Amino acid sequence: NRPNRLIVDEAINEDNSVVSLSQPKMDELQLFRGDTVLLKGKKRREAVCIVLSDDTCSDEKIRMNRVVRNNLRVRLGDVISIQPCPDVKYGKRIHVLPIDDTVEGITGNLFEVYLKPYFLEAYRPIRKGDIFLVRGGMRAVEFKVVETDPSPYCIVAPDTVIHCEGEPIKREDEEESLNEVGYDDIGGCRKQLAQIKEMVELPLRHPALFKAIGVKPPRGILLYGPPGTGKTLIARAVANETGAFFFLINGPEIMSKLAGESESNLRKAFEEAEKNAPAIIFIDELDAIAPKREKTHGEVERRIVSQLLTLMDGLKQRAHVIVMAATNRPNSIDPALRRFGRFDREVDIGIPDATGRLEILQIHTKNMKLADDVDLEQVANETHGHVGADLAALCSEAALQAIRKKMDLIDLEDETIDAEVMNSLAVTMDDFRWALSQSNPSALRETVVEVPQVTWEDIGGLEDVKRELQELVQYPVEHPDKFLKFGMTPSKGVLFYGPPGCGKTLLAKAIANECQANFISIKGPELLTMWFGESEANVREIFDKARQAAPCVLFFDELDSIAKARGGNIGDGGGAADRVINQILTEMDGMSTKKNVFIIGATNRPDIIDPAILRPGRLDQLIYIPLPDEKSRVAILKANLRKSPVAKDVDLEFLAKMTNGFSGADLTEICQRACKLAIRESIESEIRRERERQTNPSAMEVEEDDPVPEIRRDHFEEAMRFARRSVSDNDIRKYEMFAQTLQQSRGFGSFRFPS
Amino acid sequence: VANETHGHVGADLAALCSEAALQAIRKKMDLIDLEDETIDAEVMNSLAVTMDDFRWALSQSNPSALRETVVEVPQVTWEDIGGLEDVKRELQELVQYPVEHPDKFLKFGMTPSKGVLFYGPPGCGK
Numbered sequence: 001n002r003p004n005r006l007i008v009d010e011a012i013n014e015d016n017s018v019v020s021l022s023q024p025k026m027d028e029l030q031l032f033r034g035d036t037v038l039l040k041g042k043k044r045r046e047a048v049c050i051v052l053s054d055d056t057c058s059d060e061k062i063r064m065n066r067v068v069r070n071n072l073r074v075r076l077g078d079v080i081s082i083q084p085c086p087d088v089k090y091g092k093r094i095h096v097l098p099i100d101d102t103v104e105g106i107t108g109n110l111f112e113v114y115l116k117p118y119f120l121e122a123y124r125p126i127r128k129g130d131i132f133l134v135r136g137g138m139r140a141v142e143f144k145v146v147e148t149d150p151s152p153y154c155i156v157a158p159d160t161v162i163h164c165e166g167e168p169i170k171r172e173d174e175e176e177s178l179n180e181v182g183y184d185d186i187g188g189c190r191k192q193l194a195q196i197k198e199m200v201e202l203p204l205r206h207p208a209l210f211k212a213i214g215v216k217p218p219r220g221i222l223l224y225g226p227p228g229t230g231k232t233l234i235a236r237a238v239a240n241e242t243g244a245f246f247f248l249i250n251g252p253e254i255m256s257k258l259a260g261e262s263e264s265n266l267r268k269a270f271e272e273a274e275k276n277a278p279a280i281i282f283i284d285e286l287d288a289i290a291p292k293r294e295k296t297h298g299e300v301e302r303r304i305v306s307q308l309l310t311l312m313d314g315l316k317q318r319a320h321v322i323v324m325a326a327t328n329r330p331n332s333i334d335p336a337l338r339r340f341g342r343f344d345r346e347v348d349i350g351i352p353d354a355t356g357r358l359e360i361l362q363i364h365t366k367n368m369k370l371a372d373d374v375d376l377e378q379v380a381n382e383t384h385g386h387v388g389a390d391l392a393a394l395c396s397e398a399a400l401q402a403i404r405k406k407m408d409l410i411d412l413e414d415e416t417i418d419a420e421v422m423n424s425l426a427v428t429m430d431d432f433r434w435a436l437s438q439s440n441p442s443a444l445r446e447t448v449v450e451v452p453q454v455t456w457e458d459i460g461g462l463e464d465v466k467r468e469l470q471e472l473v474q475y476p477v478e479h480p481d482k483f484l485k486f487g488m489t490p491s492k493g494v495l496f497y498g499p500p501g502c503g504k505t506l507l508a509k510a511i512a513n514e515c516q517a518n519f520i521s522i523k524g525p526e527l528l529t530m531w532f533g534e535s536e537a538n539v540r541e542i543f544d545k546a547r548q549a550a551p552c553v554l555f556f557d558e559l560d561s562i563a564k565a566r567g568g569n570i571g572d573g574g575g576a577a578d579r580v581i582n583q584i585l586t587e588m589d590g591m592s593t594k595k596n597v598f599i600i601g602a603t604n605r606p607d608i609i610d611p612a613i614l615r616p617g618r619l620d621q622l623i624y625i626p627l628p629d630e631k632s633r634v635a636i637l638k639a640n641l642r643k644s645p646v647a648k649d650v651d652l653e654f655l656a657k658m659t660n661g662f663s664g665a666d667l668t669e670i671c672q673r674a675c676k677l678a679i680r681e682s683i684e685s686e687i688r689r690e691r692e693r694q695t696n697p698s699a700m701e702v703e704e705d706d707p708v709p710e711i712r713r714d715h716f717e718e719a720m721r722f723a724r725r726s727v728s729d730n731d732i733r734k735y736e737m738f739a740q741t742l743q744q745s746r747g748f749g750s751f752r753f754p755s
Numbered sequence: 756v757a758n759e760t761h762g763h764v765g766a767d768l769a770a771l772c773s774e775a776a777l778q779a780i781r782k783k784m785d786l787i788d789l790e791d792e793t794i795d796a797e798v799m800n801s802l803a804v805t806m807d808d809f810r811w812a813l814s815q816s817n818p819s820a821l822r823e824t825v826v827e828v829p830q831v832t833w834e835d836i837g838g839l840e841d842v843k844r845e846l847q848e849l850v851q852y853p854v855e856h857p858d859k860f861l862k863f864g865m866t867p868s869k870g871v872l873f874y875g876p877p878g879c880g881k
């Protein structure tokens with residue numbers, strides 16, 4: 001019906017004054033890339049930017065950065081007017097003034113440090129009365145455009161002088177400072193923030209709708225996870241982006257108050273939040289205000305918990321107050337808090353992933369002049385076990401180390417050192433290495449739920465196994481309707497069996513990666529720990545985690561560890577039943593409605609596995625992972641040696657074919673030994689050359705020789721001299737024996753219905 | 756949806772229905788963003804909560820009482836079990852006859868036994 005066609009959305013690419021549009025429609029907007037585009041927002045304001053095309057952008061909405069969005073005063077999910085304007089006018093002595101309370105970050109000259117590096121060749125169209133953010137000197141300064149020779153807007157070009165003021169001026173209060181938290185500042189969690197945004201949009205973004213429709217929106221959300229995961233960040237960003245009035249109920253803030261009037265503070269906070277519609281009440285450290293009852297005989301603790309319960313149940317559906325809470329784990333707060341209507345929905349922020357850690361690194365490293373040597377990927381990979389707060393601390397430590405090495409060495413320090421000198425220093429990769437050496441998590445214990453990054457390329461061959469895994473996992477999700485049509489319920493359970501080191505864990509990770517489903521790996525040591533400690537109730541917690549991360553692929557690697565611990569094959573006097581496997585069976589039987597979670601088991605000793613594991617509703621689909629073939633061996637060798645620099649002269653196919661029955665582990669060991677031999681030779685040769693050369697100063701030429709720059713053939717012969725066959729033919733005999741026993745009997749091959 | 760909602764309670768079902776309604780309102784309706792203090796009813800009448808919404812809600816249900824033991828009148832009938840005529844007859848005797856005709860059991864001074872034990876090969880439908 002002739003819509004506006006312009007919507008507000010988050011920006012994926014790092015850029016200011018740039019707006020992305022959906023690639024499918026260029027004639028509708030009638031503008032392709034690289035053209036000034038005007039945009040009308042609200043309250044009689046407009047902005048000018050440059051338009052590009054993004055394949056990921058949805059046609060319905062137009063991705064845009066937070067700076068431009070603040071300029072328009074629009075918010076995420078809003079609808080505004082767009083107007084393709086090929087016309088654009090240059091400017092003369094474009095004027096800029098310091099704005100807001102941002103001050104003391106610059107000394108002496110204040111225009112060469114920030115404006116010049118950014119407006120040089122940027123061609124960013126500047127309009128009267130807009131604020132644009134400049135990043136530099138480990139700082140962010142927003143500059144207002146108050147004066148300009150042409151009106152109302154002009155595209156900046158490298159031919160217009162800049163008028164210098166250097167006098168900061170307070171910005172209008174109704175305007176929102178861009179230093180406040182937002183969606184961009186909150187990374188590493190991805191799709192939990194989407195769930196919270198969907199959860200909170202209608203109650204806050206469209207409040208009047210719920211007054212004309214009778215339905216209850218979510219008024220209680222429990223953000224729970226390890227400390228430092230950004231739960232407070234999520235709450236603040238949701239409050240700011242939706243415009244809701246954010247109120248912070250600090251856990252120990254009320255609890256430090258004298259008994260009998262701290263309840264007064266809680267009630268006053270609830271009343272104040274109710275007074276201003278819509279609002280968000282964030283109870284930080286909720287496990288301190290309303291913790292586990294009876295295991296709390298204080299006396300006033302019970303009163304405070306009851307007051308909190310009355311307040312939560314006292315929400316009269318008036319206003320649009322959303323009560324969000326922060327807790328380390330759902331099991332730490334009083335269960336009565338988790339009832340319906342109080343906190344009926346929980347989001348597990350959890351530790352970030354490798355990509356999450358990387359993104360957190362970019363958010364925390366953006367004003368510091370990250371060095372050119374660093375790329376932030378190696379640090380992210382090595383930062384396993386850290387949380388977003390840990391990454392921020394690591395970045396701050398790296399910045400401080402850089403400031404200590406350079407800069408402060410001279411000791412030319414004053415009340416506010418000149419910015420540009422700090423711009424001169426870049427945080428080098430050595431600083432990041434030192435910070436990683438001084439990181440010390442801090443959340444290394446927590447279980448990791450990640451979308452595995454291994455792909456089918458990493459796993460060589462296994463075409464039949466790969467196809468069945470695709471069938472079982474991908475087909476039900478991709479075509480649920482067709483599974484419903486034939487009245488067949490897809491089985492939820494696989495069991496990989498085969499010789500050790502054949503890549504069952506990698507196969508499970510690859511199948512999880514293809515479906516883009518989180519992967520939870522329960523190794524043998526964890527099951528053995530639950531067995532020795534006689535704590536098998538943690539299996540229930542594991543399954544709950546799988547439920548929270550659904551869709552997920554719960555993989556139980558080396559599931560036969562407990563059977564081996566009880567005696568191996570002969571075992572004890574008892575049967576195959578054990579506590580941990582029994583709990584797993586109970587959970588698997590009850591874990592049928594979820595549909596998302598997929599259970600994969602791996603075992604190198606299928607004979608000793610409990611038969612109840614294989615009953616219907618359990619890991620019915622047994623898959624034999626045999627030793628890699630010649631093509632599989634070639635693929636495994638190529639995958640192992642991809643990172644290492646291998647000379648083209650070495651014929652890897654010959655090595656793969658010569659390895660008659662080596663497992664994947666054996667091939668990896670051979671590759672590692674070859675790399676070690678190459679490294680030892682390089683270190684010894686370079687060192688012995690340097691030792692001789694250092695005797696005479698400058699003696700030999702300055703020629704930059706690389707004695708060994710790639711793994712040579714001789715290194716591969718050196719490696720093969722120690723080649724070992726991990727898997728004996730007798731236990732392969734046992735695997736084929738179990739596969740035969742599992743075979744569908746005999747005599748029914750020729751079965752045919754009568755014609 | 757009812758069959759797939761095993762483990763939920765009445766409140767859970769209400770929450771699922773509310774979530775489906777909100778998802779339907781989000782897909783259509785609020786996409787245009789033509790919202791006021793009280794949007795016109797009939798447009799909301801135009802939108803019907805589609806089965807895709809219910810599927811999504813079930814995907815976002817998360818019981819909430821899945822642990823509790825279930826006491827249900829089983830919906831399987833004798834048709835589902837093939838043959839077993841003799842076994843079916845004795846089960847009818849032992850269970851149904853005492854309840855249907857307590858007076859006749861009282862007349863002969865016999866107290867019906869309360870306990871059966873099915874034994875046989877696995878998977879035969881006990």
Ligand SMILES: Cc1cc(OCc2nnc(SC3CCCC3)n2-c2cccnc2)ccc1-c1ccc(S(C)(=O)=O)cc1
Nearest residue numbers: 476477480483484487488489490491515517551595596598
């Ligand atoms: C159609 C259907 C899909 C389904 O799945 C949906 C699903 N989502 N994520 C997953 S898994 C996760 C995805 C990320 C990685 C792994 N799944 C799933 C479930 C089971 C097996 N494989 C996948 C379940 C069960 C059914 C149905 C089949 C028959 C009948 S009736 C009338 O008795 O005949 C009723 C219902």
Ligand SMILES: Cc1cc(OCc2nnc(SC3CCCC3)n2-c2cccnc2)ccc1-c1ccc(S(C)(=O)=O)cc1
Nearest residue numbers: 849850853854856857858860861863864865866867868869
């Ligand atoms: C007449 C009688 C009925 C009875 O049952 C009643 C009953 N209601 N629900 C059930 S079971 C349930 C129904 C839903 C499914 C299953 N029952 C029941 C009890 C025992 C065996 N089968 C059924 C018990 C015992 C007696 C009596 C028999 C002999 C004597 S005297 C003088 O020593 O000779 C005294 C008392």
Ligand SMILES: Nc1ncnc2c1ncn2[C@@H]1O[C@H](COP(=O)(O)OP(=O)(O)O)[C@@H](O)[C@H]1O
Nearest residue numbers: 185186187188227228229230231232233388389
């Ligand atoms: N996922 C994340 N993305 C970006 N910054 C994060 C993230 N997690 C933590 N941080 C940083 O660590 C700080 C502390 O985390 P915070 O959320 O305030 O504590 P809590 O998790 O207990 O609520 C935050 O102020 C933020 O700067």
